[model samples]
Target: IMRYPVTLTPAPEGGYMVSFVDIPEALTQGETVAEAMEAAKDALLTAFDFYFEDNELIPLPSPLNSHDHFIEVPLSVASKVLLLNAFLQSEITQQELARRIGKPKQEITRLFNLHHATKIDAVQLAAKALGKELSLVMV
Candidate 1:
């Protein structure tokens, strides 16, 4: 359920400019609303790299307001973000998590790589190692 509100403004010349409310670092533009939305999703996902690289906490999505358009973070990426945040909050080293999960350090590294196709079960196991659990519910 990692969705962020965005604002789409018509560009002066043409196209649409998209910006995330929660993640200021993410911004994109496209020739149309649909295209702009797609760009926004990519931009938002890309923004996570900065947070992860700097060991900064990713901001939680703020509650939606009437004047907002939102983009959903795909389940795969969402799970990793959840796991990353939980690990950060737990103040445990990646090596420690690897030890606890009985996995290699490289496997633990892959869990945080957004582009990696990490199994949801692997993410859940990592969460469990940090004393957390990831769950999904249809809305």
Candidate 2:
């Protein structure tokens, strides 16, 4: 449901930097581009959540062609994005999710899209909102 473009720039201080051009407050870096992308996903998620929680406008997701550099989000974030899209297809709005989780709709939206650091409770609530249940299999 969202296409967040992150900028992958080489840091002069010796690491790869990844920042969300659409949400400048969201920035991060790591030893490599791969790790920086991962950090960037978390950065965007948390930053967006705080922004929304404080009643700020949720910046639009970056378009695919509007970024400064090429970037790729890891599977951990992509998988959740797909899951949310699928749920949306079924007509499950964030308000419905709020009712399921006993929270405000805004909070559900925050968890569903922007809260990449989401807790297991919120994830479980997401599943419940979709008439599903979450189960983790440890290998």
Candidate 3:
């Protein structure tokens, strides 16, 4: 799970401002704590787009400490992030992963498309190709 810490500050105009600790680029505000937190999740997810576009590794979330609120990225997004980092660390081109998985080169592109609702099975297969495993744990 990708759970990032966030700081919420009361806005001068009577709303809550949210900012992610790990992802400085992500910021949002709302009229209430619940709304602010919801917006925070969307902001955090949106920030990943820049990293993906630039082929830069996304920052790993730091563990939560005292005095911090937290937001969890969706499991789908988390899986994509894991795959992206593993693929980057492996230093293999997208075509290479396609060859390893016996899929078309374009499939590799779709795998990293955050907006695409890729199947978990496909993500797991890609992770396996990169010598990584994607799993979920019940809490």
Q: Give the lDDT of residue 4 in candidate 3.
A: 92
Which digits, one per residue and each the tens of the lDDT, describe model 1 over residues 31-63?
999899889888987899888777788998999
Instruction: Report, for every candidate in turn, its global Cα lDDT versus the true structure.
Output: 0.87, 0.64, 0.88
Candidate 2 per-residue lDDT over residues 1-139, each given as its tens digit: 3467777779999888777767878778889877887787678777755654554555556667643443454444544554465465567666776887788776665555543466666766676667776665655
What TM value does model 1 have?
0.90
- Report the Cα lDDT for candidate 1: 0.87
Clashing pairs in 2: none
What is the Cα-based lDDT of residue 70 in candidate 1?
88
Clashes of 1: 0
lDDT of 1 at 69: 81
For all candidates, what are the clash counts? 0, 0, 0
